[PDB]
Amino acid sequence: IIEFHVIGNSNRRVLLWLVGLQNVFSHQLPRMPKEYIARLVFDPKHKTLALIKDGRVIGGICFRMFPTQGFTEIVFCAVTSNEQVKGYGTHLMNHLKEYHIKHNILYFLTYADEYAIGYFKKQGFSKDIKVPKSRYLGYIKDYEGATLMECELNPRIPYT
Amino acid sequence: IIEFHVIGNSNRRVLLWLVGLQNVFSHQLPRMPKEYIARLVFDPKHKTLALIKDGRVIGGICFRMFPTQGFTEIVFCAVTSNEQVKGYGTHLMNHLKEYHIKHNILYFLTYADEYAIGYFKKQGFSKDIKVPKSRYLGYIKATLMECELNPRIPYT
Amino acid sequence: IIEFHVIGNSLNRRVLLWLVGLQNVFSHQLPRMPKEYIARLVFDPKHKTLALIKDGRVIGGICFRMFPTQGFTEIVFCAVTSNEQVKGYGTHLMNHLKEYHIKHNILYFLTYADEYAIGYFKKQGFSKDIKVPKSRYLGYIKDYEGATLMECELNPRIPYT
Amino acid sequence: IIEFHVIGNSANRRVLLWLVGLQNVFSHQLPRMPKEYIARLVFDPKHKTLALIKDGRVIGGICFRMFPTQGFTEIVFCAVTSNEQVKGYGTHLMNHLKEYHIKHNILYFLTYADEYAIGYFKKQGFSKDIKVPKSRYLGYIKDYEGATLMECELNPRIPYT
Amino acid sequence: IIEFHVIGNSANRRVLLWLVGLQNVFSHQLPRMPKEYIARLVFDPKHKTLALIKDGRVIGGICFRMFPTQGFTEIVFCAVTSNEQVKGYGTHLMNHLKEYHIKHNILYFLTYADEYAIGYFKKQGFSKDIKVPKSRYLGYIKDYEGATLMECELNPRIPYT
Amino acid sequence: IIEFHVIGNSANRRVLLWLVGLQNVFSHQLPRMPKEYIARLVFDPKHKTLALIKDGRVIGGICFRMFPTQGFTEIVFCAVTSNEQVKGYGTHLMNHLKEYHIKHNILYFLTYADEYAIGYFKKQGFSKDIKVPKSRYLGYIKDYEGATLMECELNPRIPY
Amino acid sequence: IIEFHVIGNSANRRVLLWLVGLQNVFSHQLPRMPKEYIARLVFDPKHKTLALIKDGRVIGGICFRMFPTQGFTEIVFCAVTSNEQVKGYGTHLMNHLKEYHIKHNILYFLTYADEYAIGYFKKQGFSKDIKVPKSRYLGYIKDYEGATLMECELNPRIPYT
Amino acid sequence: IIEFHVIGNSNRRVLLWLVGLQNVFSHQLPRMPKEYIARLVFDPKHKTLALIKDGRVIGGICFRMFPTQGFTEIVFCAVTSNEQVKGYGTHLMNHLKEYHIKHNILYFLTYADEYAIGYFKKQGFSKDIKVPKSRYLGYIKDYEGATLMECELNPRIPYT
Amino acid sequence: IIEFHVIGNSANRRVLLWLVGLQNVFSHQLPRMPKEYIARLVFDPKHKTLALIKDGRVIGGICFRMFPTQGFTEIVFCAVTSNEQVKGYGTHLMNHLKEYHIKHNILYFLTYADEYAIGYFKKQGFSKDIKVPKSRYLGYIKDYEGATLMECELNPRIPYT
Ligand SMILES: CC(C)(COP(=O)(O)OP(=O)(O)OC[C@H]1O[C@@H](n2cnc3c(N)ncnc32)[C@H](O)[C@@H]1OP(=O)(O)O)[C@@H](O)C(=O)NCCC(=O)NCCSC(=O)CCC(=O)O
Ligand SMILES: CC(C)(COP(=O)(O)OP(=O)(O)OC[C@H]1O[C@@H](n2cnc3c(N)ncnc32)[C@H](O)[C@@H]1OP(=O)(O)O)[C@@H](O)C(=O)NCCC(=O)NCCSC(=O)CCC(=O)O
Ligand SMILES: CC(C)(COP(=O)(O)OP(=O)(O)OC[C@H]1O[C@@H](n2cnc3c(N)ncnc32)[C@H](O)[C@@H]1OP(=O)(O)O)[C@@H](O)C(=O)NCCC(=O)NCCSC(=O)CCC(=O)O
Ligand SMILES: CC(C)(COP(=O)(O)OP(=O)(O)OC[C@H]1O[C@@H](n2cnc3c(N)ncnc32)[C@H](O)[C@@H]1OP(=O)(O)O)[C@@H](O)C(=O)NCCC(=O)NCCSC(=O)CCC(=O)O
Ligand SMILES: CC(C)(COP(=O)(O)OP(=O)(O)OC[C@H]1O[C@@H](n2cnc3c(N)ncnc32)[C@H](O)[C@@H]1OP(=O)(O)O)[C@@H](O)C(=O)NCCC(=O)NCCSC(=O)CCC(=O)O
Ligand SMILES: CC(C)(COP(=O)(O)OP(=O)(O)OC[C@H]1O[C@@H](n2cnc3c(N)ncnc32)[C@H](O)[C@@H]1OP(=O)(O)O)[C@@H](O)C(=O)NCCC(=O)NCCSC(=O)CCC(=O)O
Ligand SMILES: CC(C)(COP(=O)(O)OP(=O)(O)OC[C@H]1O[C@@H](n2cnc3c(N)ncnc32)[C@H](O)[C@@H]1OP(=O)(O)O)[C@@H](O)C(=O)NCCC(=O)NCCSC(=O)CCC(=O)O
Ligand SMILES: CC(C)(COP(=O)(O)OP(=O)(O)OC[C@H]1O[C@@H](n2cnc3c(N)ncnc32)[C@H](O)[C@@H]1OP(=O)(O)O)[C@@H](O)C(=O)NCCC(=O)NCCSC(=O)CCC(=O)O
Ligand SMILES: CC(C)(COP(=O)(O)OP(=O)(O)OC[C@H]1O[C@@H](n2cnc3c(N)ncnc32)[C@H](O)[C@@H]1OP(=O)(O)O)[C@@H](O)C(=O)NCCC(=O)NCCSC(=O)CCC(=O)O
């Protein structure tokens, strides 16, 4: 049984789900400090789309909506190792796109490292940034050596 | 700055401390599944004595008090790798003892793997179990070890 | 479509009808248990039932009573309807019940089995060796003279489902 | 010690277990009626059941649905448990239901009777002549095609109990 | 006209005078039990009394204290007034108490029986074999040293009344 | 005027100062016991103390812990102030303690007696023969190596 | 590790046990003060005590009574436990008490000192020259026959700690 | 049965007790106007320690607490004639002292006539007045020919 | 005994006197700004100050204005009292301010530094190279003629304290 929930720090079910998400993100991104991942996962202005399989967290996308700035930041995307290469990361991004169309945010921005660029390209992201710099600089962190990537959503098509 | 705090799930800082504790327990005891460490650490009946250095969790002792049965179960003990062999585990157990003196629970029970029995022996634990099996079977979740406390010694 | 639910009567209409269906399956599969005794336990607030649902319809379940102060759970009734037996449903039911009890920090099952049900419990890991002290269960679990008391110990490092 | 009570799921525990017992008696005495269908009707708030209680225990009953805007009542289930049959309980059940409906000013019963119970309904005054207009019940009562639609007219001037 | 009622001081006037009558019957039938001790227990909120009422008047009863956390009930006083004895009232009193305890899921009675009434308790199924662990009652029930501790196990599957 | 009162931490001003007076008498008469340990026990709500009052002031008492699930009571501290000893006061305190426990269906006392006072416990009916099973008292009573475990059996009584 | 706390009896076990510890230290260091009198004042709610805490344990304190309507504070008890004396703790206590009173705008201390205590108070700036008139303190502070009344004047423009 | 109550005008029991006190004071002090005694007994800022024997008033002490001035005025002391020379007047003053220690007023002042001086001396009063004149003058009435007397209380001793 | 507190005027007596002490320190260490202007900003509700408290006394601080809608904070005043300079306090202040803003999801500081302060800001990692576009800060912070705009970029993954 597979399930998708948008959760966040505002219930013990959600709390343990947020811990599972922090565990998956941290294990899959080990050269990122664990407490930084924890702080963002439990930050109230951050949300995570949780992928639940048999009541257990197997992946998710931590994101940050900036409705005032007209875009959403993709922070963390991860699926646990034994569940990768099965389409879960694509289904997660599709659900996230549908969610954002219904909230009328049609631009994704993310600073991608070299290991994630291929995944983002296959989700429709590109290095051609239409959103002006004055709208994102400082709101999202420009990590040196990371690649800024953008995805524009079409609100006339069904992603899920 | 070193500080000790008895915390648990009933505040963002305590919450992040509980996540940090769940991380340290999971990493140093890789054989217990992470989700089950998580549910034990966030269980209201469970408490954790947290060792905080400069606002960051570096170790702790997760424990379950059984005042009706006369003892406390030690669930997880861990100090993060780069802080071991510094006496932090001893200070942790000392504070746990002092805490339990103040609550008049005078027996610890725990299951120790062969890798850690020497630490527990240096904290006064023994494999001679004085609590009857009829008292702890089913309450404490390896080598069973017991520590008896003396409510006259100041442990800290 | 297969479903599993822990339900019970709380001091909702679907749960009520599911409990009536569970009382029905328990009664038909356990003809020596009086119908009203099954109904009284199934609708008792401190009893829970793990219901096994196929196409929105009860085809099996396990009724149980948790004793967290005593450190064990009592297995009250287990049944799968006849035309769904010998398909693994009773084992999946027990597996789910084990997972549920790990998540609630209860690692001991106690039950009484007659000669016809012992084999089922043995295959689910139950044994005639009872480690729980009698001072912990006598007077809290339903006693059955002439049946065999059986015990299952769970390992909370293990996923059963 | 015999008691009659009109009950339904609007319930305390006694009424809840009484409704379970009624669903059990109906289901056992009507074995080709699906148990889950009997359960939904017995626990439906728009349905009531006249319970026959002997020594605190259900031994029979009549499940029915009143249609006061239509001026009649639909008889749904009638059953007495096996070891209490042929003692007049079914007749006393129907008499109490008639008296109940006089005091609520519903003077027509409609029911479908099969080959096993049509003689019982005939002895309670039911007839195959349907005086209620067909347009008044065709969209309201369940049509049990194959069984015989029967009607009973009540006289609000005689005492039935 | 006989009635059974479980009452206690939690009382309207009828219950108050019923409790006085019970204290009178207990005290007269147990003449070496101090009247004031009987009164305090009969009027203690933690104690209940099953009253046997004949024509609006107390003719017997059983005072008892339930220990649900301990899983048993302590039988304190049993008495029937002199001119109603040897008629089965004491047996019907005990049967009603058993039925009451089944429905509250307490399945063990403990009592001290002296030389004048041990045969009555034996005929109600009490035995000198105490299955309840000594650690479970030694701090809760009054120890009437000189009398014999007896135990009765209840079967929640049979009807006692 | 002599008064006996079973008191404990819940209290009101009268009871509070009596508890302090009890902690004083216990501490002065048992000077190798840590003062704050006696204080923590006397003010622990699961412990009770039978106070012996003369002219509104504590001159003695018995601090005890009831274990009804186990069928006995642990006697923790017994003391009478120095200028009031050898007058029968300690016997009357133990007699009242027995009466109180007979009414509450506790028929066993357990206590650890040292060499300075074991004779006093013997005269109150205590003996070294422990009939309470070892499985009932371990972990509940504070165990002391170097002192002698003593037991007293009470006779039950029907009141009035 | 050293801490200073102003406490008093107004639910808090830690404060309660600290007050007991302060009462013990005052009593042991002032053997001619009756223990119950020390207790009655230490637990009096118009009295406060500045507690000197080392490693969670009371090792000294100053019990005092603020008279804001009269413009002074009465020093009631001062003590440091024997094994911690002659280390500066008594001086640090009084300095903290002075700083506490500067921030509450009470600039006079009064106390009665016996011959053995006069030296300590003189080293804390107290004098036998009393500027507060007798009509301001007599009958408010407790007087002591034969002890020496001492006064300390505080400067609110000076940091004491 | 003997009883002590501190009562005053703020219940019919207390009212009739205040009438009995007014009767005893007036009968024992007959050259004082009856309405003056009545006015003071029923004045809300005045209190009377009532001595009750078998439900009937047999004596009392009408007093006036001046906590702002740090003393209490003794206004009327009387015991009915057939109950005098039995220690009741002493027990009344002892209870009044204990009451005032618990309220932290440790000085009594009274203007005594020649017939009462002996009683006050045996209760520890003297003509040596420590309380400065500026603290009592005008608050208590200096009747010509009356003797001002003072008693200082020791809060470390039990008076009852 | 050093403490750090983020405070501002929305009330508390402790906070109010601290804000006065901060206005005093800023004004004395920056004597050529009008002290009325410093007071207005320090007590403005949109402004916060990170206060450095030593032994209960204000010895320094950083007054700042968070602009979360613009994604940066303006550094308004920084000062440490003269007797406490060149001890690392200014560095610890800025470190605590960096950690505070990381936890509030603000990653840029901007400040207009006079010539005497440039060296201090450079040591705290500030730069003259301004990455924030002019449209984001012009008009929210005041561009004093002759002052040097400097920027500090923060890293959410770095522990600053
Ligand atoms: C990247 C994900 C989330 C992808 O999950 P899934 O495996 O479920 O993806 P999928 O839906 O099954 O489809 C994968 C398809 O993309 C293609 N592809 C190319 N590069 C890929 C890459 N690194 N990972 C996964 N797929 C990749 C595959 O060939 C495959 O081709 P088809 O089209 O034929 O199916 C996972 O692999 C993972 O958790 N990796 C470790 C953590 C991680 O790197 N997260 C992203 C960085 S998140 C972060 O904040 C780090 C900093 C940063 O992003 O820079
Ligand atoms: C074991 C601890 C908690 C001990 O903490 P520390 O390293 O800070 O110890 P310390 O206070 O600095 O030093 C105490 C003394 O113990 C002695 N000693 C002997 N064997 C030791 C051993 N395996 N580990 C640590 N110390 C040991 C050392 O000589 C040491 O110095 P001296 O000789 O000078 O005195 C830690 O090292 C750790 O986290 N290890 C990995 C996790 C772990 O093993 N946990 C235990 C099981 S957890 C549990 O309670 C049950 C869980 C389960 O197993 O199911
Ligand atoms: C027992 C169950 C619940 C099991 O249902 P299922 O048929 O779905 O089980 P399954 O997973 O498909 O098969 C499990 C395996 O156990 C082995 N086996 C041996 N003896 C068995 C026995 N009596 N019952 C079921 N399985 C048994 C089978 O060979 C089977 O295959 P493999 O060997 O190849 O693996 C059912 O048969 C049933 O409803 N029976 C009637 C009701 C009943 O007896 N309930 C239990 C007592 S009621 C209770 O809980 C106690 C209360 C009391 O009585 O006091
Ligand atoms: C029919 C009842 C409810 C009747 O109960 P009792 O036996 O107590 O009736 P009684 O008062 O004792 O007897 C009254 C008279 O009915 C007569 N009689 C004729 N045919 C009968 C028949 N099939 N069943 C019972 N009685 C019958 C008896 O001989 C008797 O005649 P004398 O007085 O002259 O001596 C019972 O037999 C029963 O539970 N049967 C099984 C369940 C059932 O069939 N229910 C009705 C199906 S209809 C239904 O509810 C389902 C809905 C649907 O199918 O549409
Ligand atoms: C004991 C009772 C309550 C029983 O009342 P009943 O006479 O109505 O009993 P019953 O149902 O009519 O009779 C059932 C069977 O018990 C049998 N039997 C044997 N010994 C008996 C005995 N001493 N008293 C009464 N019945 C006795 C009868 O022969 C009969 O046998 P068959 O069926 O085979 O023909 C009564 O006798 C009574 O009130 N006695 C005086 C009060 C008393 O002793 N109460 C119990 C003391 S114990 C108590 O409550 C005090 C607490 C304490 O002391 O610890
Ligand atoms: C022990 C007590 C409480 C006893 O009080 P009293 O002096 O008032 O006793 P009493 O009623 O007047 O005398 C009763 C009889 O006890 C006898 N006897 C024998 N040894 C005695 C002993 N050490 N102290 C007092 N009495 C003693 C007397 O001779 C007398 O014999 P006759 O029949 O001929 O008249 C007191 O002496 C005391 O406060 N001692 C110091 C504190 C202490 O030691 N407590 C017990 C610690 S024992 C321990 O290890 C912890 C357990 C605990 O403290 O509860
Ligand atoms: C008096 C204190 C509280 C002082 O404590 P400390 O020893 O910590 O003081 P200190 O700061 O370490 O020493 C300060 C210096 O004062 C000098 N000095 C003078 N008299 C001293 C005295 N009695 N005790 C200790 N030091 C004293 C010493 O030379 C010392 O060194 P240098 O000069 O070289 O620097 C303590 O000694 C104590 O607890 N004594 C017993 C209780 C007591 O006496 N309480 C006071 C009366 S109680 C009260 O308040 C009045 C109530 C009443 O009696 O009516
Ligand atoms: C004065 C009292 C209240 C005392 O009452 P009691 O008789 O109960 O006193 P007591 O407790 O029994 O003890 C009396 C002891 O004091 C000694 N003594 C010396 N002179 C005494 C005197 N006038 N009255 C009573 N006792 C007196 C006695 O010898 C005796 O000696 P021992 O030590 O050996 O036992 C009573 O006598 C009384 O009511 N008198 C009339 C009213 C009165 O005068 N009240 C006081 C004035 S009140 C007022 O406002 C009037 C104005 C004014 O006071 O000036
Ligand atoms: C500037 C501060 C706040 C710095 O406080 P501290 O002395 O505690 O700093 P520190 O951490 O101890 O020392 C850090 C190092 O900065 C280095 N350094 C280089 N140039 C410096 C400069 N102009 N001012 C201060 N430090 C400077 C020093 O070498 C020093 O040693 P190392 O490098 O060897 O370690 C203080 O000195 C002060 O209050 N000055 C007066 C007011 C002021 O000028 N504030 C500056 C912001 S001016 C303002 O408030 C508004 C106007 C504006 O924005 O300019």
Swiss-Prot record, chains D, E, G, I:
Binding-site residues for acetyl-CoA, renumbered to this chain: 78-80, 85-91, 116
Taxonomic classification: Eukaryota, Metazoa, Chordata, Craniata, Vertebrata
Highest taxon above the source species: Eukaryota
Active site residues per record: 74 (proton donor/acceptor)
Native organism: Homo sapiens
Subunit structure: Homooligomer; may form a tetramer of homodimers. Interacts with EP300, CREBBP and ADA2. Component of the TFTC-HAT complex, at least composed of TAF5L, TAF6L, TAF3, TADA3L, SUPT3H/SPT3, TAF2/TAFII150, TAF4/TAFII135, TAF5/TAFII100, KAT2A/GCN5L2, TAF10 and TRRAP. Component of the STAGA transcription coactivator-HAT complex, at least composed of SUPT3H, KAT2A, SUPT7L, TAF5L, TAF6L, TADA3L, TAD1L, TAF10, TAF12, TRRAP and TAF9. The STAGA core complex is associated with a subcomplex required for histone deubiquitination composed of ATXN7L3, ENY2 and USP22. (Microbial infection) Interacts with and acetylates HIV-1 Tat.
Name listed for the protein in its UniProt record: Histone acetyltransferase KAT2A
Tissue-specific expression: Expressed in all tissues tested.
Modified residues (N6-acetyllysine): 48
Gene name, Swiss-Prot/TrEMBL: KAT2A
